[PDB]
A paper describes a structure:
Here we report the use of “Build and Retrieve” to define the composition of a raw human brain microsomal lysate. From this sample, we simultaneously identify and solve cryo-EM structures of five different brain enzymes whose functions affect neurotransmitter recycling, iron metabolism, glycolysis, axonal development, energy homeostasis, and retinoic acid biosynthesis. Collectively, the BaR approach was then used to reveal enzyme identities and solve cryo-EM structures of these brain enzymes with resolutions ranging between 2.69 and 3.40 Å. Interestingly, malfunction of these important proteins has been directly linked to several neurodegenerative disorders, such as Alzheimer’s, Huntington’s, and Parkinson’s diseases.
The ALDH1A1 enzyme plays a primary role in the biosynthesis of retinoic acid, an important signaling molecule that specifically interacts with the retinoic acid receptor. Subsequently, we were able to identify this protein as the ALDH1A1 enzyme and resolve its structure to a resolution of 3.40 Å. Each subunit of ALDH1A1 can be divided into cofactor-binding (green), catalytic (blue), and oligomerization (orange) domains. Presumably, residues I166, P168, W169, K193, E196, Q197, P227, F244, A231, S234, V250, S247, C303, Q350, K353, E400, and F402 are engaged in NAD+ binding. In our cryo-EM structure, we did not observe bound NAD+ in our structure. The catalytic site of ALDH1A1 is surrounded by residues L114, S121, K128, T129, W178, I304, V459, V460, S461, and A462. Two missense mutations, A151S and I157T, have been identified for the human ALDH1A2 enzyme, where these two mutations are strongly associated with congenital heart disease. The corresponding residues in ALDH1A1 are A134 and I140.
Residue numbers in the entry:
A (entry chain D), B (entry chain C), C (entry chain A), D (entry chain B): 9 to 501
Write the structure that this text describes.
Amino acid sequence: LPVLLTDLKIQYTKIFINNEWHDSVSGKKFPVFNPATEEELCQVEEGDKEDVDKAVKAARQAFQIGSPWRTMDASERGRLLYKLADLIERDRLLLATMESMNGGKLYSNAYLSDLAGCIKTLRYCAGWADKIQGRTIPIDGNFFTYTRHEPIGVCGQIIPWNFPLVMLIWKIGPALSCGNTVVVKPAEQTPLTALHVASLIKEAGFPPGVVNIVPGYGPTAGAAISSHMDIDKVAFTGSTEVGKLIKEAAGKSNLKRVTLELGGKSPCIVLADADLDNAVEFAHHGVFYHQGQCCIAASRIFVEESIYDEFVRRSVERAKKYILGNPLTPGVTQGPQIDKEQYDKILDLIESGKKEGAKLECGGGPWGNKGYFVQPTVFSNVTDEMRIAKEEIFGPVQQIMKFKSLDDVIKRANNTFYGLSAGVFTKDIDKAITISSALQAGTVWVNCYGVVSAQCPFGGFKMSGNGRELGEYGFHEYTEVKTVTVKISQKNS
Amino acid sequence: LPVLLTDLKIQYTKIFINNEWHDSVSGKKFPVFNPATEEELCQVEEGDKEDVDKAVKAARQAFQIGSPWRTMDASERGRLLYKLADLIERDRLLLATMESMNGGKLYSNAYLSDLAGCIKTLRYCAGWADKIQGRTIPIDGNFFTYTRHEPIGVCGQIIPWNFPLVMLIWKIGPALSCGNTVVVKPAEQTPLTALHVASLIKEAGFPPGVVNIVPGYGPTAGAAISSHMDIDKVAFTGSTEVGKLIKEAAGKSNLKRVTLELGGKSPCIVLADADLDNAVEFAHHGVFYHQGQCCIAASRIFVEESIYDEFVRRSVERAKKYILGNPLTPGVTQGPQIDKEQYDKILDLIESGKKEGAKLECGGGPWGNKGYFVQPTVFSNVTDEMRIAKEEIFGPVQQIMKFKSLDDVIKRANNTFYGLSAGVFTKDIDKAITISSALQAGTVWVNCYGVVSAQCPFGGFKMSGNGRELGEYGFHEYTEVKTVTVKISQKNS
Amino acid sequence: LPVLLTDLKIQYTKIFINNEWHDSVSGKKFPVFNPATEEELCQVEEGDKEDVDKAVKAARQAFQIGSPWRTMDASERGRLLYKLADLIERDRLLLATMESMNGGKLYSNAYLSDLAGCIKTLRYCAGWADKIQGRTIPIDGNFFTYTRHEPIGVCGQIIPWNFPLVMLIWKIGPALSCGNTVVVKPAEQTPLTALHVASLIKEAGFPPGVVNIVPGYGPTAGAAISSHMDIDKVAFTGSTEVGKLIKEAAGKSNLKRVTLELGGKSPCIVLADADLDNAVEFAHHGVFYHQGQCCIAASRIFVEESIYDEFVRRSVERAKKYILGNPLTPGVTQGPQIDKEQYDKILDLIESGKKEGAKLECGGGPWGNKGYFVQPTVFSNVTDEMRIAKEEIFGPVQQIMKFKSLDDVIKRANNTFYGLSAGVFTKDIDKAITISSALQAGTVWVNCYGVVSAQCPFGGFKMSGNGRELGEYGFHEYTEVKTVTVKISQKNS
Amino acid sequence: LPVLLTDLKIQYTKIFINNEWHDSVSGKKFPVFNPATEEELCQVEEGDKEDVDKAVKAARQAFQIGSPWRTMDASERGRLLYKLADLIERDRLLLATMESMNGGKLYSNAYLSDLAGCIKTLRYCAGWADKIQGRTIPIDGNFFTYTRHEPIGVCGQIIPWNFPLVMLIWKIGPALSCGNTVVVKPAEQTPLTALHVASLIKEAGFPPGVVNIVPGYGPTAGAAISSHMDIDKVAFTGSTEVGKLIKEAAGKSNLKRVTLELGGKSPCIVLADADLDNAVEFAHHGVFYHQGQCCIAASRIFVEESIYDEFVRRSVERAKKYILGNPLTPGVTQGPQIDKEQYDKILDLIESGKKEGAKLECGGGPWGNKGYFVQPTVFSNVTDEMRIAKEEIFGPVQQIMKFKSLDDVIKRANNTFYGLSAGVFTKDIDKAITISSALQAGTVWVNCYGVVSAQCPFGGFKMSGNGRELGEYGFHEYTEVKTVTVKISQKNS
């Protein structure tokens, strides 16, 4: 793992529309800060309805019949995606640093893990461009029918900071692969990662106006991209709240297609037969990976009575072993949160549990002064009524209940309004298959966790989301399906 | 074609929940009327939040793990669907009559066409139950992944009267096939068709509480089924208005999955090389089939200059040849509309065009006294600014513009906020393929129209709809996709 | 289970070509016998090159463009298949009896199991007729491509007696579904089952000359159907020997497509953690189901040392519990073999093991006088060098080795030239997935056996077979794939 | 187009097994010659049963469980393929030259066309490695089934010279993608192209013993690779003769899977409405591309009476316009044939037609002295009885019949024992679809020809071939399908 000791510089801070770095009409530029240190990083600009509208207009152009981007052979879309990927891999070092300096994330995590993931989505999605096929339904009659999988149109993507670049990639890969044009709105907590990738797309040679990024504060662009009368798909990844907002506006605009992957409270279910060693390590990443800021974080470990206490032991034991240090520092297994917003919130949640008599086995507070560091916390004896068990503590905090039966645990996990993921640790074949099905989640993990690959479709059940991403199924959201039926004369089977 | 001279009787007028004919809590029962005669047919009941909630509760029961309906082998779901189909075909005669007496529709159309269609969806969907398969993604790592296509849960279906039974079937086929449980809310203009089919499902042996129908006025159940905190999918087929309503509530409830197939203004594009004979006949069904009450009605025929007038001639010529008579009378090619609502509206639209200087080549008014009969109308010299060219005249009325180029016509059709369907009549290979793609519709028809088969996916682009129906793609809306990843030891390709 | 005490009558004994019961040119009619009693059942006829050629000619007619069978909408092919299925289910009783009286098979097995299976293939395959679709490859260039899945042509099917009707159905379902025409050659040991089904197809209304059956001795028709210069696919299910014969002639005729599902020696691998109870019962059906005359019979159980002896105990224990009685007698769990051929052979194999020092724990000989009954036998301490462990003892005989490691057992099973199936009994998740993959078989069974459903593709690896059957993959053998590429003008994505 | 004036050097002339350049056991090395000049190019070695057996042994090693090549994540197989592709593109210039110097082919054709094609297969096939998925059949019962698409094993590929590198790529792409190991036997007329690519695979980092090339004379290795008792798939691309040979040995060895794409006589069908301009140009490439040495060459143009003569005119007109010059010379549109073998044969065929009274409108003989150059020939007034119309004149020679009806022409084309391809030139929609279906070919071309892309499956009907290549369907030949069924407890839909 190379280290970019080079003081990371922010090369891009402006809006990218028509492959050109515009500015803000109001001339208003918001400020980005290093949450690991609280210092300011730079002054990216802030978009508004004008810029969204501006870019959306760019999109329709890119998407028009006989455009450069529509007549381009699909294989060539794939060829271009592969280049962005290859370009991102070349600049990996820096791009990895710009995520840490702005997302506050262990570098080993934003290099050995994140940027690699981003490249691999674009690589996968590239090889899926020329393989999205139609059908030739053997209809009845002397007619000949065939479905065509065709691009939707302009796609608006609202991303969340947690994974500044991975989700951008998870959304401009399936999109650009199927042939759609994207207006990307990156988050406020972190605008740098994307703006930079936009420059690499331009080097890749993507046509002018295919991928338009409109960095800028939420409320504003949101309603816009999500109510333009020219955008057809709004894909939002963020918290449930903003989500009902985006979907509402969707109806109240054009019935545009809406795929939203909100979050959830996911349950781990270690069982008497589990290899506690394994369950302990993986239950650990589950809650303390990226400082619990992954929508798939195990904010609810249920351990069977038999092995409740033991689990508790190592669980907290390893918890304290995390290091609230510098994401830009080696050996650091935990970084800042992200901002006073989540930061204060996290602490508040920690407090609530305390009030609720949570078994605060560790942490409970913050570490250090400048920046935003919370102390790897743990709450034993959590009950299904504790707030810590009813909400997304999106942050480092571990809650751990106790169950005595299989039916009870699967019921006590499915008693939520969420279903992004789950972990059943077991050493039994029958349990594995029953608890994997009885659980209501989009992705269940048996004896592992956080294992998400591009190939595998990912999304959420219930109010955890809408649609899927990655996979072969994530290219179903960005392609409409035109049936054409011709009147041939005699139709022979 | 047999004729049910037998005075059609309304056997069912009450709510079907848990395979039992309940009543209305308020004891309020709405009245259904024969639009062909305006006489009342019977007194079906009217549901409310209580009954919706009642039935939704029935559903969750039906859908529970180890339920009778979930442990049932998929093949058996198919076996049961095939029986409903076979039962519907046995009772065809009557069931055909109950649609005419309540939908006001030519019997030849509700027998030789509609009921046949209804059976064939259920037959198709039945043979799709045991063939919805997952995958075994060759993921990276020594892990083994597989996607499972699993039932969503309780599905709420809001149907429109136009096709009282076909859409019920288009929605309880893909659903019941994939294993979901349905709470069906039929329309007010016509509750009889469905309630009856519900009885046939019970004879078919469908478990108790799988298919619950809650007949009842719109506003009420609507918000309910569409905001229950236990229904997961709301599929609505109706007008755009109610649609943004259902989707907005969706977000403002559970982010439940929402597939809505609203309507559209569809364009026919007869061209200089077309076989006017063919184009004339098919452009005729396009607008005057089921009294223009098909969301795919050609409310916009564009004829190239060369053959504008000629087309106009036969077009109107055949128009007058339609017969505003008795849907329950043989030889009648047109029946009542449906109710003063659409009836008055239709006439109003007719008037507006008159005010707009539409070339009222025929009709313009109503025919007969009792019931709701409009005179097959036609409006030549329509312009893209005439109201008749900007709205769904959902009723018998034909509008006919004139275009001089291919680019112009395809632009003047794609200049709408709709895209359910279209008809390009041509005798040229290149046109066919370009105009079929350049057009923005879910279903384009070349040299034919109204040709919709179950096998072929159907839905709408733009604000014409959301998702698809029928097809192999219509079983993509009712199945969620669970990825399970196991940690095997060594993984060999 | 109803019982057809009615003295089963053989209604059909002649050749079915053009939906008509022809005879034999030579006038030669072979004799069929009841192996349960050795009495003769009737005198079916014997075909020859003339009759094969005769029927093949019928086929080409049925398959010609604009034929009745080619212009028939696929849905209608499915509709017709469903009727044969429904007809077979109506006559189930008798048809079940005609298999027992001729195959010598426990009635409970030829009713509660076999005929049910036959119906379910035809039901499945029926619902697969209208869903075999092409694609619309997004090729490069301004061209438009689409693959059409089209019928091969006349298909020749050589069946084996063991499952007289199930394999006929496994071959005239995928075929008739995809639209091909079949010339079926049934076995000598048992011609009745099929000839009868042919009559039911005719009642079903299948066109005249679609399904032509040419009953008749092997050698003769074989080379014919398999070297006609008008048949395109020869699907043979039988022993390896005849198979290399059919394939060699294939090349030496027309390179016709050849899918052959020969047999194999399949290995069960019970392990220390297995539920011996379960493993014992299922390992039992594995070898003594249908008198070991199933190509998937466990002629090789490997038990780990730990639980070797115990397994041996119950294994033989239950073995003796089988009853060499009357297949047409209730309570009989084992019937005759099939004919002196296999009968003598079986006994010979039994003897060879004895010579090899097999641990003859039970049986070893025949039971009763008339007919062909062998005594449920068992051979402990079998070694990988014993003939009983190198050949298909296609008959009741159980061999049981002992293994001490996982690697060793999976190696000692994969050391064959076969791979139809296998059974890994385990209670461990990791073993299950590794031994299921490490094993070289088309169908591996974990903790069960003989579980074969229509939906699941079935065939053999290595010299155990060629291609697959059932499944969605079994409609890949009977459909060729025509790519058509048109030169459209501008091609927009 | 860069030109490798650099005297092309033959870097590789030896056998590649275990990523090492072995030699020949007999020490026998065959000689390769430049057919454009008849001079010798170098002295490649000649393999035998020993070397085949040698390499096959290497393969099994590469394919073993836990091998480096089997545990490799599929994505990584794709990553490696992409590198070979990228490496081939880097060396393009030379590799293009080594095909011309040895295949005798216009450089513009072996650069701007061939090497590009080779790279694009490997690029496509690479992106298909991680997307070959199984299924999760919703079987009946409380069982859980899933099909696994798994590598077959060692694959033996016999290539033909015509496209020395493209077919190597068409066979080591689908193979290496699905995970199989290949023993490639290149042709005698041309061994250089492949041996070189083998070096690039090694640079790509493909494991040691995955791709083993055994250059060497036909008869020898043939029977070997095709009868090794360790190779499972033999894919041969060549003439029909050798094909029945390879398939017969297949049965007479292991029933190994056999996909053979032999050749054919393909028919063009220009029609009265065709754009003769277009039909003329494309009918030209059809027969004179790569000197008629493409298995898809239009050795049978049928022109409707109306426009027979006209077609004849330009057809021959452009024919003479071809240039029998130097494939390594710019502006040369035709090169040598390949060797006295085809060369003498070609001339013989030309003579036969002369004897048959063919309307020798042009050519008829050879051009120049050294090398192997035939004069672009044409034969008008060909009849369906002329030898030139019953055999593959695999070489430059054009035959042109006359037809008066559609039915007649489609019958006169389908009256062959072949079906690789066809060209229907038309300007009518109905013809296009009927003649495209009525024709019996794997690939029909409407208004174009020779248009073959990787994405599109390609193979032959009838005795023109077996199986398909490219496409998503070409990864169905190299993957077997293991069904695993587990006994879960309760199975909920």
